[PDB]
Amino acid sequence: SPRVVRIVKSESGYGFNVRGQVSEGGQLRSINGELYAPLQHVSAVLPGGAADRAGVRKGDRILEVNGVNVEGATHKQVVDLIRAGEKELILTVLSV
């Protein structure tokens, strides 16, 4: 089920990598049996980093960034949203 995590940036960043499609939209793919448009996901978590401590997990799919729905979003849209805040990031994620 979707959950919200708050992550405070360190000087070296949030401590995770995001990976996913360049383009907008695309074929539906269910995540834990629920239909969604394509989602960007967390492809790495820095051990001991901010994301790790906040409970972000490898493979987490990203549904919202800073209160903005990113279902079907381009990679650039999600990166730009993650970078929107000076030091805080709020994600809605789905663990797989």
Binding site: V18, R19, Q21, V22, S43, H75
Partner: peptide
């Protein structure tokens, strides 16, 4: 096509 970024 997929891209990865370090955040």
């Amino acid at each position: 096509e997929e891209w990865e970024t370090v955040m």
